[PDB]
């Protein structure tokens, strides 16, 4: 009766986004694992780019603009601009709330 350890994953958030974009559509376990790995890889890429951006400018804080510059560097064009728009909108809403 040894309970397995807690393994964190983005499965629930990916499922919520899928239900937002496709209500009557499911996802298999392998596809969910692939999406989780994609999220982890993109997270690592953007975080590393922001970290080296901060190091280059001799800054000790990763801020919104560092993440924005990382997104602009790593994403191909229209994806980058739409991601920047979504990020700025989310940050503005969060700041407006509290």
């Amino acid at each position: 009766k040894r309970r397995k350890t807690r393994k964190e994953s983005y499965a629930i958030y990916v499922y919520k986004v899928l239900k937002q974009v496709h209500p009557d559509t499911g996802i298999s376990s392998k596809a969910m694992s692939i999406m989780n790995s994609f999220v982890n890889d993109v997270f690592e890429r953007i975080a590393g780019e922001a970290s080296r951006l901060a190091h280059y400018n001799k800054r000790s804080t990763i801020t919104s603009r560092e993440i924005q510059t990382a997104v602009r560097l790593l994403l191909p064009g229209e994806l980058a601009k739409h991601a920047v728009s979504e990020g700025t909108k989310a940050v503005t809403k969060y700041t407006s709330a509290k």
Binding site: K30, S33, I34, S37, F38, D41
Partner: protein, 81 residues
Amino acid sequence: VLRDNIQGITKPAIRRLARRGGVKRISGLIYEETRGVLKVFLENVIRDAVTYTEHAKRKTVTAMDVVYALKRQGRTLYGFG
């Protein structure tokens, strides 16, 4: 001790791999070259994976070790953690 296992990649298997790659006609000498290339690639990936496993003080090569080995060689693989 295993030996002569590179021959386990049979001619039909290489032909299927070429067909998935869009190859229509295959020379008879393709198979030895493909076996050598696959052996070199597997040697590199397995060497990196075994290095990762040895650093972890493990005696079992895990899927995460293979994933890290592939990612180090610029060949990130999804679906295994």
